[PDB]
C-alpha cells in the first residue's frame, strides 16, 4: 500500500520535494530538477560573520558542552565545569522551528497530474502543452533553490548575533569588578564561590556588595 504512485515506483515520504518523476498519482511531494536541498538548523562546526563573535574574538567551539547551543565555562577554588544557558537556547529553538514550519507551509499545492495524447495533425497543441509544463517546472526549481540558499545565510548570522548579545549581557553586569582578557573570558578581582558564579549565570549579580574585595 502507498500514498503516492509514479511510473517508476511507489513512495512514502513526508518531505516537501522529490526528484523521481514528474508524473504522480495520489498525495505526493513537489517535483524539481535539483540534486541537493539541505537546510541548516545549527551553527558552524569548529571543533578546534556579520557580528564578529563566532570565528571572531571567540575562536572555536566546545565539544564538552552538550546540553545546549550557548553557555559558560567556570573555574574557581572548588573546581571547574561547563553549563548551558537555557533562555538563549530556547529563544533560538523557537525561531528556528518557526522558520522551518513556515517554509514547509508555503510550499503546498495541488497534485495528481497526468499527461495527454495527441494525433499527427495536432502538433501545435502538443508543443504548447510541453512549453507550459517546462515553464512551470523551471520556475518552481528556481524558487526552491533560491529560498534555501538565502535562508541558510540568515540562520548563521542569527546564531552569531545570539552569541554576541549573551557576551555583552554578561559584560555589562560585572562592570569594573572583573578584568576582560579579550578572548571571551573574565577574571574576577574578588573571590567568587559557587553562589557568586550561580548569580552571574542567573542575571542577579550584586555589584555593590563585591566592590573589588
Amino acid at each position: 500500500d502507498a500514498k503516492c504512485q509514479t511510473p517508476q515506483g511507489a513512495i512514502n515520504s513526508s518531505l516537501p520535494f522529490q526528484n523521481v518523476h514528474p508524473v504522480t498519482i495520489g498525495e505526493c511531494p513537489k517535483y524539481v530538477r535539483s540534486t541537493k536541498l539541505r537546510m541548516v538548523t545549527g551553527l558552524r562546526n569548529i571543533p578546534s560573520g556579520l557580528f564578529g563573535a563566532i570565528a571572531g574574538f571567540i575562536e572555536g567551539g566546545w565539544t564538552g558542552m552538550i546540553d545546549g547551543w550557548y553557555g559558560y565555562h567556570h573555574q574557581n577554588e572548588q573546581g571547574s565545569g561547563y553549563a548551558a544557558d537555557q533562555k538563549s537556547t530556547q529563544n533560538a529553538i523557537n525561531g528556528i522551528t518557526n522558520k522551518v514550519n513556515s517554509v514547509i507551509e508555503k510550499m503546498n499545492t495541488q497534485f495528481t497530474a497526468v499527461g495527454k495524447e495527441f494525433n499527427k495533425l495536432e502538433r501545435r497543441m502538443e508543443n504548447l502543452n510541453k512549453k507550459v509544463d517546462d515553464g512551470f517546472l523551471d520556475i518552481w526549481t528556481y524558487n526552491a533553490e533560491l529560498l534555501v540558499l538565502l535562508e541558510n545565510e540568515r540562520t548563521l548570522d542569527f546564531h552569531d548575533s545570539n552569541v554576541k548579545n549573551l557576551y555583552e549581557k554578561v559584560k555589562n553586569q560585572l562592570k569594573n569588578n572583573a578584568k576582560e582578557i579579550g578572548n571571551g573570558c573574565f577574571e574576577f578581582y574578588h573571590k567568587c564561590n559557587n553562589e557568586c558564579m550561580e548569580s552571574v549565570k542567573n542575571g542577579t549579580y550584586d555589584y555593590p556588595k563585591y566592590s573589588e574585595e
Partner: antibody
Amino acid sequence: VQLVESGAEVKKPGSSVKVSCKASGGPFRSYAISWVRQAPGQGPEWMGGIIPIFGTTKYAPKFQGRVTITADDFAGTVYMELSSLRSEDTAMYYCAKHMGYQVRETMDVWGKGTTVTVS
Amino acid sequence: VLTQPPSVSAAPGQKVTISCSGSSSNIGNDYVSWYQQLPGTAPKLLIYDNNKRPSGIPDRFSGSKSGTSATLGITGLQTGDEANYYCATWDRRPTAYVVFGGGTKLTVL
C-alpha cells in the same frame, strides 16, 4: 496542542509492541516529549523522553536496554517500541509534553492514554 | 524515592496539607511539581516551580518547599477535590530520572 495516541493492543508474552503519538500544530516542535505508564492500582511512572533538534534520548534505569524512542519530524510523530513483553507490562500508556526543550519534572499537556495487555 | 502520607481526609470547607518527603538528592536540590488525577483521566498539573500555578488553577491550591520536604495545600475544600495527588521531581545523580511520589488519596466526608 492536542496529543493523540494509537489504538489499544493485546499481545503475547515475549513479543514486541510499538505505539505512536501524534501532535497537532506545525510538524516541527520546540518542546520535549516523554512516555509514561500506569499499571492498575499504582501511580504514574516515567519511561523516557526525546529532545528536539539535538535528538538525544533519555531512559529510566529499569527500562534501559529494552525501550527505544524514535521521532519522525516531517509528520510530527513519536514512536515508542518495547520488547521482551512480560506479563507485568499490561498498563495504560501516555505521551506527555514538557514546557521547554529539556526533559524535566513538569509536564503540562497529557494525552488520553491507551491500554496494552500481555496475556 | 519520594514519600507521602497514604491517605488524608477532611470536611468540606476545611484546608488540608499533603507532605512529600525524601532525601537531599531529589527535593533537597531540585524543584517540585504537584499533579492531580481523577478516576479515568490523565494527571493534571497543579503546581510547578515549587510554588507556582498554571492558568486555570484556582487560588485555593498552593505549594511550598522547605529544606527536604514539600507541602501542598488545599483550602475551601470541595466534593470535586477528591482525587489522587502526586509529587514529582528531577532526581539527578547516577542517571537523572523523573521520580513521582507514592501518592496520596484525599477523601471528603
